Amino acid sequence: GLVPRGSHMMEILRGSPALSAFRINKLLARFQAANLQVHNIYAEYVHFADLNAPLNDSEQAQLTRLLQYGPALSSHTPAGKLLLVTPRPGTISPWSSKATDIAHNCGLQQVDRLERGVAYYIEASTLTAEQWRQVAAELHDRMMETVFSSLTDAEKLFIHHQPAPVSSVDLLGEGRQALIDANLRLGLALAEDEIDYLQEAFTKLGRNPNDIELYMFAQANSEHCRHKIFNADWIIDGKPQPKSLFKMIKNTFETTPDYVLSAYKDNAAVMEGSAVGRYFADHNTGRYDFHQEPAHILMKVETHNHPTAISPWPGAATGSGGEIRDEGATGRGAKPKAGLVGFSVSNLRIPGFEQPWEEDFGKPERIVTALDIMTEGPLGGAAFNNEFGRPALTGYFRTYEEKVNSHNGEELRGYHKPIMLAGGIGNIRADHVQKGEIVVGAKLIVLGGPAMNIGDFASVQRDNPEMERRCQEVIDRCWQLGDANPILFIHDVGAGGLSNAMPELVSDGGRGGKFELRDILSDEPGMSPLEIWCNESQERYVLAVAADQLPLFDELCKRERAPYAVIGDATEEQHLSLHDNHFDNQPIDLPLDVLLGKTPKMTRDVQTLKAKGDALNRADITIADAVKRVLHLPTVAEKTFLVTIGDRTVTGMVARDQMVGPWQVPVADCAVTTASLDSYYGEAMSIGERAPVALLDFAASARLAVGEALTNIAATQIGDIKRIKLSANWMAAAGHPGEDAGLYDAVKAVGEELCPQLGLTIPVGKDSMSMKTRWQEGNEQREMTSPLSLVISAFARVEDVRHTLTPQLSTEDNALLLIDLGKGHNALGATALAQVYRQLGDKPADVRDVAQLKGFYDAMQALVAARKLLAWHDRSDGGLLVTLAEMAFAGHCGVQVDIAALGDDHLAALFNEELGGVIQVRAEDRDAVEALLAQYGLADCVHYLGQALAGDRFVITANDQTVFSESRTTLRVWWAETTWQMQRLRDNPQCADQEHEAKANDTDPGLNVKLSFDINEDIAAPYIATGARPKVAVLREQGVNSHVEMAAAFHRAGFDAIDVHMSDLLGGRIGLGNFHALVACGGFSYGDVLGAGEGWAKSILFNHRVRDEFETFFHRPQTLALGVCNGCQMMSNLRELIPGSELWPRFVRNHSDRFEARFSLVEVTQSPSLLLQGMVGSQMPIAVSHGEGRVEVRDDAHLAALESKGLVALRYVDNFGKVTETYPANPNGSPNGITAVTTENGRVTIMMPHPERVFRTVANSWHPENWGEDSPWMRIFRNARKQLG
Ligand SMILES: Nc1ncnc2c1ncn2[C@@H]1O[C@H](COP(=O)(O)OP(=O)(O)NP(=O)(O)O)[C@@H](O)[C@H]1O
Ligand SMILES: Nc1ncnc2c1ncn2[C@@H]1O[C@H](COP(=O)(O)OP(=O)(O)O)[C@@H](O)[C@H]1O
């Protein structure tokens, strides 16, 4: 590769086989389905290096090297037709950006840009050009990639472009017509009253508006950016209204201002946290230390809906991503702590798993199917959360698509335009909650990555998390500076891009701002001022720093490799200006208010509509078929396929994840994180949502939302109900018949009543008002319309993280006491039973007693505190039957209950979705727990069901009449089928199957322990007592996300953790010659591009000074090096620097071809490892979270030798005890369960699971009842102390 390409040279570098066997097999499988006679097919990755200069031999080889990664699969000689798949031209992909990073960090400056593509070699050769476009169509994403017929054809990808000039709308010379033409041309979606405004304003000035100015205006004054509906004057049925929607939401903050530090004036809301030890690396000493101070909790939840319907992955990625910017940009700087995903789609209709209630209603040719969204969507947001470094600990997933007779007659009600929810929490320093003032002359910086044109087709987003991580560390570095925090005011970049972000900043500071277009970083020179000021690129932040703090900010950013650029100054005169240094002119100039200009307030004059709706027909319904159907509804069925694709262990403060009990059943009601690594205080996240009800009663749906949120979060020690702060996210189809009035009534219901009545606040929200899709099916039009979808996300301050409860039942003497808040209304309308039978029902569940709901909370709070309960699980989708079934799955046992005291309607008793739940109290405690519940007038609601027994019998009785009797393992399996099925079409079929097939063996003993040592014996204490703290280099490369907890572990082990960034070595600041203990940390170094750990390791291996530095470290006679996750792969590529590491394997893509976030069970095997000393023979579970941890040997003899030399320290074992290679007891698929090896002298030990994330007992998903503060994994670190003398 060296063919003529502009002022550059493009080089073609052949790579490794792309599609991993089973995929190719599925490819041809799908080819036959379209009558395409495709015999064989071979995918091969091919790299393209755009060079500005030349590479000498040594450099030419160093490049070919960086480009050898992935699984060592067998190579095929090209045969048949070639079909190259590259990203669409005029687009730079995340792979490219991250991959190109690596090149530069390796001294290859000649490498201008690296881009990758897949080269398909197909053998069918008997198809018409027609049949070929089809073959092509099956090989790329029409929304992101494009096919080429020649490898050389990829030159079009690196075509340089000239900066396009700014154009101007001729108002003065053409009249108002010009505003009309430009309105359609540029598609500004401007209303009459607004074109009027612009018309006048520009005549007052006396010059033509510049397309850029006009577009910026369009953005700043759009329904989304101004939230016009939510601030309109209302008129319901001829009677005008008093408050708007927002004012009614604002009501909850006027009535319950308690614990709120910031609300309705930032990117998020902030409430009071607790007095914990904030751990971070000191700025001067470069040493992690605990800072005993208040750590406050901020919360936010956003909705990236439409862009998700177009291109799912980008949709969800930039969903979590946007929310994370808000969090980070909250106040004067904060740190995201955890997060919650959420989805709402139409019927899946999984091929060969077509459910009884599913009926194809067609869909717009221009969007993607519900199943597609549910395959690519989850992977996108998960991709971002994982790369970035925040655990996704709770959420929801709902499907609904039915031809239901609702409020506007009979229509199609679903989610063809999906709800893509992404929100979470964070911790903010006390003295930072408030934005500082922007002093005149403040440097207006843009912290983030180079812009590209992103905001038809322009709904296809881009995601580069590793860029946001870098930015996050820069935020961090800043708030960590205590009072020296340079960020006077930070804000996030989102819609409208900078053309809204920057003005918005200077305005929230009562300033103006003169900017310079050519100072802004951009990866596409060809852009126009409009395109550079209004492009909605990702991973960007805006902030203002005092001029004399610029040196510090620069040095901080550089060290983190997070780019930034000063683009303007703060002016005293309210006035925005954009100077172009290339076209020597000024694209923007106008008084600030001219933009923030207003016309009439919206006024919606609507009418009410209440669905008549007929009572549920019971012809096909039978208790038995009901149970079988419900357990098959996506909204109810096990969600393993959304839980495990996203990390739930990072930060090492995950006290309560989705997985519950020894059997890891994903039935956790809320998520609980510890506020610090040295405390038992924390935060709690729950999610309330019941959108179908809105198709029968708008107020009910809204109320039930707050209800479930509460019932889901109740089994957590919080105290005063006023500690819970709600975020209301409103999804609706404004304009659709009656939905409008229904919205107002529902908002009134929670805003002006339910919430204020309980003591609940709503400091954060967001609103989507177009949840309906219109398209052409036949010669007639079809419309899919969403119900009033309110999604309440609850956030609270946990008092004692140790007292949280889960659904895991106990076999000891017990009582299953039902707390029916429905007061026996047992409604069946708008339920899972109804949906599953293609109906809407008669009357839906509703919050019956406002006082009892709080009574329920106070009651539960009392018990949680007193430790009277053994288990908890609220009632929602699928009612009591599903709540009891799950508790039986979670506890892997049986239930013997009786539902006679619940009424004759046994169907309604088991499937009523009324508020409430089931508590499992010890037997000897029944009376007292019943008496307490009585004190809160709840005595009328409580009913005794029965007990939980050891077994497989799930029996529900009614006196002496067996209402339903089945095997708990049979149900446990049906419920899982939905997730089993998704995994099949997404992950490796073999794995999806093995995981599902193992759920069938009732003899699964679940996670169980064995301890070769005393996990409570602190063999470090003697050294800690001398006060001498050995220094340990806690190594991190750009992209790493663990480190903080890793330091906290060595720290507890008596060490003195130091923050050492790779830049710290390459820049010369720090030297390894001073450390005796090194540690490569986990994360997504360079986003894993060019291979996980690869770019990180090769960045060392290439630079001679740093190379030497490291080798001289391992060779020294007194060192110790550790390498958890990511940092395990990094070191494994430094075999050439580490003594005693010849037999070491290479870590590659997991067999399942999917990231695995699991709590897997390992066995400590014999090995030289000094880090694992005295733990040999032990068996405890560990935090497994990686997508490239599979061991790979050259051949049998290699593994044969590796085993034989005994370099294996950790192996996976099934819950029985034997070493297994079966999924997912052995997640990655490593031979003989290997996930850790060592050196011959045991001084260096690399592994894959995270011993750091679980050094605290409370951070283990499940763990034996009697464990202390420390977990068995703490030992590793204490070993490093001892060992180091
Ligand atoms: N309908 C609403 N109900 C409650 N709070 C709201 C609502 N709309 C907005 N807010 C809050 O008021 C503030 C600003 O609205 P906003 O349009 O959300 O900018 P943003 O969320 O900070 N950043 P971005 O998502 O990039 O536009 C935020 O703190 C919101 O959480
Ligand atoms: N989209 C999602 N992403 C991650 N976890 C999810 C998602 N949807 C549901 N979950 C998790 O699945 C579990 C069960 O979901 P669900 O039955 O809706 O819970 P609940 O009954 O509490 O409403 C919970 O632990 C929840 O956090």
Ligand SMILES: [Mg+2]
């Ligand atoms: Mg739910």
Ligand SMILES: [Mg+2]
């Ligand atoms: Mg629940």
Ligand SMILES: [Mg+2]
């Ligand atoms: Mg549920």
